[PDB]
Design a protein around this motif. Structure first.
Motif, PDB file in Angstrom:
ATOM      1  N   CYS A 217       0.841  -1.178   0.000  1.00 12.27           N
ATOM      2  CA  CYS A 217       0.000   0.000   0.000  1.00 12.27           C
ATOM      3  C   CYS A 217       0.869   1.217   0.000  1.00 12.27           C
ATOM      4  CB  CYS A 217      -0.937   0.000   1.206  1.00 12.27           C
ATOM      5  SG  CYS A 217      -2.179  -1.300   1.118  1.00 12.27           S
ATOM      6  N   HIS A 218       1.882   1.233  -0.846  1.00 13.73           N
ATOM      7  CA  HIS A 218       2.498   2.548  -1.074  1.00 13.73           C
ATOM      8  C   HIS A 218       1.881   3.148  -2.324  1.00 13.73           C
ATOM      9  CE1 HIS A 218       6.211   2.835   1.653  1.00 13.73           C
ATOM     10  NE2 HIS A 218       5.659   1.667   1.938  1.00 13.73           N
ATOM     11  N   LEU A 219       1.558   4.418  -2.242  1.00 15.90           N
ATOM     12  CA  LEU A 219       1.198   5.165  -3.441  1.00 15.90           C
ATOM     13  C   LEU A 219       2.429   5.847  -4.022  1.00 15.90           C
ATOM     14  CD1 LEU A 219      -1.762   5.809  -4.662  1.00 15.90           C
ATOM     15  CD2 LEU A 219      -1.259   8.147  -3.904  1.00 15.90           C
ATOM     16  N   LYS A 220       2.966   5.267  -5.092  1.00 21.67           N
ATOM     17  CA  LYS A 220       4.063   5.906  -5.801  1.00 21.67           C
ATOM     18  C   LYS A 220       3.478   6.655  -6.995  1.00 21.67           C
ATOM     19  CE  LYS A 220       7.374   2.332  -4.414  1.00 21.67           C
ATOM     20  NZ  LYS A 220       8.415   1.375  -4.883  1.00 21.67           N
ATOM     21  N   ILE A 221       4.116   7.753  -7.386  1.00 20.04           N
ATOM     22  CA  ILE A 221       3.619   8.557  -8.502  1.00 20.04           C
ATOM     23  C   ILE A 221       4.739   8.852  -9.490  1.00 20.04           C
ATOM     24  CG2 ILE A 221       2.798  10.825  -9.202  1.00 20.04           C
ATOM     25  CD1 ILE A 221       1.173  10.772  -6.496  1.00 20.04           C
ATOM     26  N   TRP A 222       4.523   8.399 -10.727  1.00 29.46           N
ATOM     27  CA  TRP A 222       5.489   8.519 -11.818  1.00 29.46           C
ATOM     28  C   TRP A 222       5.125   9.605 -12.826  1.00 29.46           C
ATOM     29  CZ3 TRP A 222       9.967   5.745 -11.772  1.00 29.46           C
ATOM     30  CH2 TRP A 222      10.034   4.650 -10.903  1.00 29.46           C
ATOM     31  N   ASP A 223       6.054  10.522 -13.074  1.00 33.45           N
ATOM     32  CA  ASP A 223       5.863  11.518 -14.120  1.00 33.45           C
ATOM     33  C   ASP A 223       6.383  11.012 -15.471  1.00 33.45           C
ATOM     34  OD1 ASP A 223       5.595  13.724 -15.714  1.00 33.45           O
ATOM     35  OD2 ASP A 223       6.520  15.130 -14.310  1.00 33.45           O
ATOM     36  N   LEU A 224       5.477  10.813 -16.428  1.00 32.52           N
ATOM     37  CA  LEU A 224       5.828  10.243 -17.729  1.00 32.52           C
ATOM     38  C   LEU A 224       6.569  11.241 -18.604  1.00 32.52           C
ATOM     39  CD1 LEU A 224       2.761   8.020 -18.652  1.00 32.52           C
ATOM     40  CD2 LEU A 224       4.998   7.369 -17.748  1.00 32.52           C
ATOM     41  N   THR A 225       6.535  12.510 -18.219  1.00 32.57           N
ATOM     42  CA  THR A 225       7.347  13.486 -18.912  1.00 32.57           C
ATOM     43  C   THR A 225       8.783  13.225 -18.486  1.00 32.57           C
ATOM     44  OG1 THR A 225       5.545  15.119 -18.672  1.00 32.57           O
ATOM     45  CG2 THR A 225       7.679  15.934 -19.483  1.00 32.57           C
ATOM     46  N   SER A 226       9.027  13.190 -17.179  1.00 29.05           N
ATOM     47  CA  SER A 226      10.355  12.832 -16.692  1.00 29.05           C
ATOM     48  C   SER A 226      10.740  11.353 -16.835  1.00 29.05           C
ATOM     49  CB  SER A 226      10.500  13.238 -15.213  1.00 29.05           C
ATOM     50  OG  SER A 226      10.288  14.631 -15.053  1.00 29.05           O
ATOM     51  N   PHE A 227       9.760  10.451 -16.742  1.00 28.78           N
ATOM     52  CA  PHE A 227      10.039   9.053 -16.501  1.00 28.78           C
ATOM     53  C   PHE A 227      10.817   8.918 -15.192  1.00 28.78           C
ATOM     54  CE2 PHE A 227       8.395   7.184 -20.300  1.00 28.78           C
ATOM     55  CZ  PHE A 227       8.651   8.061 -21.330  1.00 28.78           C
ATOM     56  N   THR A 228      10.345   9.600 -14.151  1.00 28.05           N
ATOM     57  CA  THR A 228      11.032   9.657 -12.871  1.00 28.05           C
ATOM     58  C   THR A 228      10.026   9.481 -11.740  1.00 28.05           C
ATOM     59  OG1 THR A 228      12.662  11.186 -13.835  1.00 28.05           O
ATOM     60  CG2 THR A 228      12.639  10.993 -11.428  1.00 28.05           C
ATOM     61  N   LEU A 229      10.434   8.832 -10.655  1.00 26.63           N
ATOM     62  CA  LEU A 229       9.576   8.742  -9.482  1.00 26.63           C
ATOM     63  C   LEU A 229       9.448  10.121  -8.827  1.00 26.63           C
ATOM     64  CD1 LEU A 229       7.975   6.856  -7.578  1.00 26.63           C
ATOM     65  CD2 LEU A 229      10.080   6.608  -6.234  1.00 26.63           C
ATOM     66  N   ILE A 230       8.241  10.681  -8.833  1.00 23.83           N
ATOM     67  CA  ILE A 230       8.018  12.000  -8.247  1.00 23.83           C
ATOM     68  C   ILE A 230       7.563  11.818  -6.815  1.00 23.83           C
ATOM     69  CG2 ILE A 230       6.905  14.249  -8.485  1.00 23.83           C
ATOM     70  CD1 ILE A 230       8.824  13.399 -10.691  1.00 23.83           C
ATOM     71  N   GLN A 231       6.569  10.960  -6.603  1.00 23.30           N
ATOM     72  CA  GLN A 231       6.071  10.801  -5.238  1.00 23.30           C
ATOM     73  C   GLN A 231       6.170   9.380  -4.709  1.00 23.30           C
ATOM     74  OE1 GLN A 231       5.191  14.907  -5.009  1.00 23.30           O
ATOM     75  NE2 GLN A 231       5.376  13.311  -3.437  1.00 23.30           N
ATOM     76  N   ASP A 232       6.212   9.277  -3.380  1.00 24.68           N
ATOM     77  CA  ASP A 232       6.121   8.002  -2.693  1.00 24.68           C
ATOM     78  C   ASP A 232       5.525   8.180  -1.295  1.00 24.68           C
ATOM     79  OD1 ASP A 232       6.415   5.412  -1.781  1.00 24.68           O
ATOM     80  OD2 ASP A 232       8.608   5.391  -1.831  1.00 24.68           O
ATOM     81  N   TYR A 233       4.222   7.925  -1.188  1.00 26.30           N
ATOM     82  CA  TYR A 233       3.480   8.014   0.072  1.00 26.30           C
ATOM     83  C   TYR A 233       3.260   6.639   0.685  1.00 26.30           C
ATOM     84  CZ  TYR A 233       2.146  12.498  -2.119  1.00 26.30           C
ATOM     85  OH  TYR A 233       2.151  13.715  -2.761  1.00 26.30           O
ATOM     86  N   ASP A 234       3.470   6.543   1.991  1.00 24.91           N
ATOM     87  CA  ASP A 234       3.049   5.360   2.724  1.00 24.91           C
ATOM     88  C   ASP A 234       1.630   5.560   3.235  1.00 24.91           C
ATOM     89  OD1 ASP A 234       2.947   2.967   4.119  1.00 24.91           O
ATOM     90  OD2 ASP A 234       3.886   3.824   5.909  1.00 24.91           O
ATOM     91  N   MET A 235       0.681   4.868   2.609  1.00 22.21           N
ATOM     92  CA  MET A 235      -0.727   5.088   2.897  1.00 22.21           C
ATOM     93  C   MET A 235      -1.087   4.681   4.325  1.00 22.21           C
ATOM     94  SD  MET A 235      -2.330   5.738  -0.397  1.00 22.21           S
ATOM     95  CE  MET A 235      -1.567   7.275   0.114  1.00 22.21           C
ATOM     96  N   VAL A 236      -0.341   3.729   4.881  1.00 20.47           N
ATOM     97  CA  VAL A 236      -0.735   3.108   6.145  1.00 20.47           C
ATOM     98  C   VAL A 236      -0.297   3.858   7.403  1.00 20.47           C
ATOM     99  CG1 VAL A 236      -0.701   0.843   5.078  1.00 20.47           C
ATOM    100  CG2 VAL A 236       1.305   1.643   6.335  1.00 20.47           C
ATOM    101  N   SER A 237       0.736   4.691   7.306  1.00 22.98           N
ATOM    102  CA  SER A 237       1.287   5.330   8.502  1.00 22.98           C
ATOM    103  C   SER A 237       0.458   6.517   8.982  1.00 22.98           C
ATOM    104  CB  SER A 237       2.721   5.783   8.242  1.00 22.98           C
ATOM    105  OG  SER A 237       2.748   6.783   7.239  1.00 22.98           O
ATOM    106  N   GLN A 238      -0.684   6.707   8.340  1.00 22.07           N
ATOM    107  CA  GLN A 238      -1.585   7.800   8.647  1.00 22.07           C
ATOM    108  C   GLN A 238      -2.572   7.354   9.722  1.00 22.07           C
ATOM    109  OE1 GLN A 238      -2.688  10.361   5.445  1.00 22.07           O
ATOM    110  NE2 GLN A 238      -1.337   9.315   3.994  1.00 22.07           N
TER     111      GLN A 238
END
Lengths: 416, 343
Positions: A217-238
Motif C-alpha cells: 500500500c504505497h502510493l508511488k507517482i510517476w511523471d511520464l514526462t520525466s520518466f522519474t519517481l516524483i512521489q512516494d506516500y506510505d498510505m498506512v502510517s496515517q
C-alpha cells in the motif's frame, strides 16, 4: 436498501440459448467480463474465459440477432485479464495481450466487423511480437496509456515502458529504478520470492501522471514526462499503525479509482478502509479514512469500484458517490458511499438488495401467482422462469451426474 | 379383486359411494356421457378374500355427460323402490339436483346460465339441513368454478335461495364439515383454503403453497388438487397438491402456529386424496395416468404402501364405507378390491 436487483439474461425471450450468428476467429467466458462504450453509442461486452485462452465479444443491445465473436488464443495470457487491454483507437477495438510465453499479441477488430453480418475478417487483425525477454523478469500487469504508449509492470517491482514507433512494433523504454537497492538491507533480498512490492492498481492522471498502488500500500507517482519517481506516500502510517497485521495485497485488483482530482484507495484493515485524498498542482493530500460497514467477520472481496458524480439518493446532501461491489463466493454486495461535503469526513453508506424479487420470492415461498399442480406444470413454470440457457445447462448437469427422469410424474426429479 | 364391466359405450367421469346416507351406503353411482348408473354391493359367500361382489341395479339416463356426483342424506329404500337425490354437473355448465324413483327422473332442478357459474364448474357437494323441529328444512348444495365464484344453493320450504361469493382464484373443491353443516371448506386453485360459516367475514384461510417443506422442492407449479375434512366430527383438514405434497391440520385445545403434519405422495395426484372413512390418518391417492394407487398414513406408519396397481389409467376412485373395500372406476370399468389388512 435504496436499490433493488433486476436480473437480465439477454437471451431470455428466445428458445435458442445461443445466437445463430457466432463466429470463431483463430490466432496462430466465465472468469472476467466487462462492458465498453463505443463511438456509435453502443455497448460491447467482452468475456475472458477461465483459462484466459478465449476472448468473446457481443453487442449488449442485440445479443440474440447480433454477432458474437469468439477469438481463440494460442496460449493463455501471462496473468489473466490483468495482462490484457482493450481500447477503441480509431473505429477499431485495439486489444493487446501479453501471453504466457512472453509474446505481445495485438488484435485489431474493426468497429464495422463487430456490428456486421460477416463471418469473415480481412487484413492483419492480429500481430505477434517479442519486444522484451519476459522469461527472466516476469510481468503481471499491463496498463494502457495511449494508442502508441503503455507501461508494463513486473512481479519483481520494475516498470517497463512500451513505445510504438510505426503502427505495429513496440520497444522497451525503461524507467529509472533504485527501489531495488533495499536489497542492501538484511531485511530484503533480490533473490527472495517474498519482498516484492509489485503494483496492484494503477491509474493515469491528466495523460502524464501515473499513479500506482503497491502491495505494501504505497502510493508511488510517476511523471511520464520525466520518466522519474516524483512521489512516494506510505498510505498506512496515517491511520492507527497496527503492528499486528496489515495484509500486504497478494494479487492485482481494483483498489483505487479517481474522478476529477479526487482519489479513493482501498486499504486492507479487516478489509475495511477507503482512504481518499486530492491530487493537485504533483501533490497527493490526505483528507480522511472512511471505514466500511461489513460484518459476519468481513469476508467480502472487492470486485470493482467506481468513483463518480453524485446520484439522486434520498439525501440531497451529496458531493460525491463511490459505487462499490463486493463478493463472497457467488453472493454479491452492492453499496454506494455518499460523501456529503468537500470534507471527506461526513458521509453515509447506502446498501441495496442483492437478490432479485423473483429469486427472493422463490426462496422465501412468497409467490402466490405461479400456477401449481402438475409435474409438467412445474416444468413449464421453471423453464419460463429461468430461460433456456440456464434450464438446459441444468439439464446438462443432471445427466452428467446420472440423474434421469423416471416418468412423466417423477417429483423426485423436479425437486433436483 | 373383482371386476365389473360398465356398458360398452359408457365412458365414466366420476365414481362415489353413498357413504353420506346409511340407508343407501351400498349404492354406487357412475356419472358418464349419457347419465348416472346405480350398482349394489353385496356380501356373497364368495371366498372370504373379497367377500363383496357388485350387482348392477340400473341406469338413469340423462342424455349428457356427468362429471361430478354426490349423494345426499335424503336417499331411502322401500319395498322394491329406491328414492334417490343426486347433485351433479353437466356439459351445459349447469349444476343440477336430480330426484328420482329408481331409473325414472321424477324431478329435476337446474341452476345455470348467468345465474349459474360463468365458467367451468370444478366441484360440487351436498348436505341436508334440518330445523329445530326436525322436518327437512333445507337441502344445501355448494359448488365451485373457474369464474372465481363459490355458489351456495339452498332449496328451502318456501323455495330456492341463491347466493354467490367471490373468490381470489378458481374454486377447485368444496365440502361441508362432518357433524357441522354450519361450516364448510372451499379450495382455490392457488393454494388458498377457506373455512366458511354460510349461516352468517368468513372464518379462516390457510394456504399450502408457502408451507412446502422444500427439503425436496415441490416445484414451480404445485397447484392444489384437493382439500377434505377428516374425522366424523370433522376434526381435521387434509390438503393435497397435484405434486403429491400433502398436509394435515387438526381442529379441537391450546394455541397453534403451523400445520400439524406434512408429507409427499410417491406420485402426482391429479384427482387428489380420498381420506379413509374410519382411519383419519389414512388416505388414498392415485397416479391416475399409469393406474397405481398409493395408500398414505399421516403418522408415517405407512412406509410406501401401494396396494393397487392396474395396467391402465384410473378415472376415479372411492372408499366403500366399511373401510376395507375400494371401488375404482377406470375408463371402461369399475373394480371392487379388498385389502385384507383393513378387515
Amino acid at each position: 436498501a435504496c436499490l433493488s436487483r433486476i436480473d437480465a439474461n439477454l437471451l431470455q425471450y428466445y428458445e435458442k440459448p445461443e445466437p445463430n450468428n457466432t463466429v470463431d476467429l483463430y490466432v496462430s467466458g466465465s472468469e472476467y467480463s466487462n462492458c465498453l462504450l463505443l463511438s456509435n453509442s453502443e455497448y460491447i461486452c467482452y468475456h475472458f474465459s477461465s483459462r484466459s485462452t478465449l476472448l468473446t465479444f457481443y453487442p449488449l443491445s442485440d445479443a440474440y440477432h447480433g454477432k458474437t465473436i469468439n477469438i481463440h488464443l494460442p496460449n493463455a495470457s501471462m496473468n489473466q485479464r490483468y495482462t490484457l487491454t482493450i481500447q477503441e483507437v480509431e473505429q477499431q477495438l485495439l486489444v493487446n495481450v501479453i501471453l504466457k510465453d512472453g509474446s505481445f499479441l495485438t488484435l485489431q477488430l474493426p468497429l464495422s466487423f463487430l456490428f456486421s453480418s460477416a463471418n469473415t475478417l480481412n487484413g492483419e487483425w492480429f500481430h505477434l511480437q517479442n519486444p522484451y525477454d519476459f522469461t527472466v523478469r516476469v510481468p503481471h500487469f499491463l496498463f494502457y496509456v495511449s494508442p502508441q504508449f503503455s507501461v508494463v509492470f513486473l512481479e519483481d517491482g520494475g516498470l517497463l515502458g512500451l513505445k510504438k514507433v510505426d503502427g505495429v512494433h513496440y520497444e522497451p523504454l525503461l524507467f529509472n529504478d533504485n527501489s531495488y537497492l533495499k536489497s542492501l538491507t538484511r531485511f530484503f533480498s533480490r533473490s527472495s520470492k517474498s519482498d516484492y512490492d509489485s503494483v496492484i492498481s494503477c491509474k493515469l492522471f491528466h495523460e502524464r501522471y501515473l499513479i500506482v498502488l503497491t502491495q505494501n500500500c504505497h502510493l508511488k507517482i510517476w511523471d511520464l514526462t520525466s520518466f522519474t519517481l516524483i512521489q512516494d506516500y506510505d498510505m498506512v502510517s496515517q491511520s492507527d499503525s497496527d503492528p499486528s497485521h496489515f495484509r500486504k495485497v497478494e494479487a492485482v485488483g481494483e483498489y483505487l479509482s479517481l474522478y476529477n482530482n479526487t482519489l479513493v484507495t482501498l486499504l486492507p484493515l479487516e478489509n475495511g478502509l477507503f482512504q481518499m485524498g486530492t491530487l493537485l498542482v504533483l501533490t497527493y493530500t490526505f483528507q480522511n479514512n472512511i471505514p466500511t460497514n461489513l460484518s459476519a467477520s468481513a469476508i467480502w472481496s472487492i470486485v470493482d469500484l467506481v468513483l463518480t458524480r453524485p446520484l439522486e439518493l434520498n439525501v440531497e446532501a451529496s458531493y460525491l458517490n463511490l459505487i462499490v461491489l463486493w463478493k463472497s463466493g457467488t453472493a454479491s454486495k452492492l453499496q454506494i458511499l455518499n460523501v456529503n461535503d468537500e470534507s471527506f469526513k461526513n458521509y453515509e453508506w447506502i446498501e441495496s438488495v442483492n437478490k432479485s424479487l423473483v429469486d427472493l420470492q422463490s426462496e422465501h415461498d412468497l409467490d402466490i401467482v405461479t400456477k401449481t399442480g402438475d409435474v409438467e406444470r412445474g416444468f413449464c413454470n421453471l423453464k419460463s422462469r429461468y430461460g433456456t440457457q440456464i434450464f438446459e445447462r441444468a439439464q446438462q448437469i443432471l445427466s452428467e451426474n446420472k440423474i434421469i427422469m423416471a416418468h412423466n410424474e417423477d417429483e423426485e426429479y423436479l425437486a433436483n | 379383486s373383482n371386476q365389473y364391466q360398465l356398458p360398452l359405450n359408457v365412458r365414466p367421469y366420476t365414481t362415489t359411494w353413498c357413504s353420506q346416507s346409511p340407508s343407501c351406503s351400498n349404492l354406487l353411482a357412475i356419472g358418464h356421457d349419457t347419465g348416472i348408473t346405480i350398482y349394489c354391493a353385496s356380501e356373497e359367500q364368495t371366498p372370504g378374500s373379497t367377500g363383496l361382489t357388485l350387482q348392477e341395479l340400473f341406469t338413469i339416463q340423462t342424455g349428457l355427460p356427468t362429471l361430478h356426483l354426490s349423494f345426499s342424506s335424503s336417499c331411502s329404500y322401500s319395498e322394491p323402490v329406491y328414492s334417490l337425490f343426486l347433485a351433479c354437473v353437466c356439459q351445459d355448465n349447469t349444476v343440477r339436483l336430480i330426484i328420482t324413483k329408481n331409473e325414472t327422473i321424477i324431478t329435476q332442478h337446474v341452476l345455470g346460465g348467468k345465474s349459474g357459474h360463468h365458467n367451468f364448474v370444478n366441484d360440487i357437494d351436498i348436505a341436508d339441513v334440518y330445523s329445530a323441529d326436525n322436518r327437512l328444512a333445507e337441502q344445501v348444495i355448494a359448488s365451485v368454478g373457474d369464474d372465481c365464484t363459490l355458489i351456495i344453493w339452498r332449496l328451502t320450504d318456501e323455495g330456492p335461495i341463491l347466493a354467490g361469493y367471490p373468490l381470489s382464484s378458481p374454486g377447485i373443491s368444496v365440502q361441508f364439515r362432518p357433524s357441522n353443516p354450519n361450516q364448510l371448506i372451499v379450495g382455490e386453485r392457488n393454494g388458498n383454503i377457506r373455512i366458511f360459516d354460510w349461516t352468517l367475514p368468513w372464518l379462516l384461510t390457510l394456504n399450502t403453497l408457502p408451507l412446502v417443506n422444500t427439503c425436496h422442492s415441490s416445484g414451480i407449479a404445485s397447484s392444489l388438487a384437493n382439500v377434505r375434512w377428516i374425522g366424523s366430527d370433522g376434526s381435521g383438514i387434509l390438503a393435497m397438491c397435484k405434486s403429491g405434497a400433502w398436509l394435515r391440520w387438526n381442529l379441537f385445545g391450546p394455541k397453534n402456529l403451523l400445520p400439524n403434519v406434512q408429507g409427499i405422495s410417491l406420485f402426482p395426484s391429479l384427482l387428489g386424496a380420498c381420506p379413509h372413512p374410519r382411519y383419519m390418518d389414512y388416505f388414498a391417492t392415485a397416479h391416475s395416468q399409469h393406474g397405481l394407487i398409493q395408500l398414505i398414513n399421516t403418522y408415517e406408519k405407512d412406509s410406501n404402501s401401494i396396494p393397487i396397481q392396474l395396467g391402465m389409467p384410473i378415472v376415479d376412485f372411492c372408499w366403500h364405507q366399511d373401510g376395507s373395500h375400494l371401488a375404482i372406476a377406470t375408463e371402461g370399468s369399475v373394480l371392487l378390491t379388498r385389502l385384507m389388512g383393513f378387515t
